[PDB]
């Protein structure tokens with residue numbers, strides 16, 4: 423992980 | 430007893446319920462009628478958001494009472 427969103 | 434669940438979409442849902450029923454039950458019934466998953470439902474009565482697990486009598490909800498429904502899903506795809 424480490425990246426966010428939300429997709 | 431009978432109660433109403435209203436949205437600001439111009440929809441009123443009539444439900445037959447018992448004073449001993451929990452807010453969870455109520456959401457389940459709403460799911461039957463409208464197809465909205467309970468996790469996506471928020472119920473408001475008398476200026477308070479209602480918690481799954483408490484009963485209609487806890488909140489002094491009686492016949493002809495009107496709960497307000499609003500929808501809430503935060504995005505959960507990511508990390």
Ligand SMILES: *[C@@H]1O[C@H](C(=O)O)[C@@H](O)[C@H](O)[C@H]1NC(=O)CCCCCCCCC(C)C
Nearest residue numbers: 423424425426427428503504505506507508
């Ligand atoms: C991030 O989302 C995770 C998830 O899988 O939904 C949660 O388990 C995790 O607890 C969440 N992290 C936080 O709530 C604090 C995040 C601080 C960094 C993000 C701040 C807001 C903007 C980002 C891009 C969402």
Ligand SMILES: *O[C@H]1O[C@H](CO)[C@@H](O)[C@H](O)[C@@H]1O
Nearest residue numbers: 425426427428429506507508
């Ligand atoms: O949101 C996650 O899936 C997406 C698929 O296009 C990626 O672009 C993104 O970086 C995350 O992995």
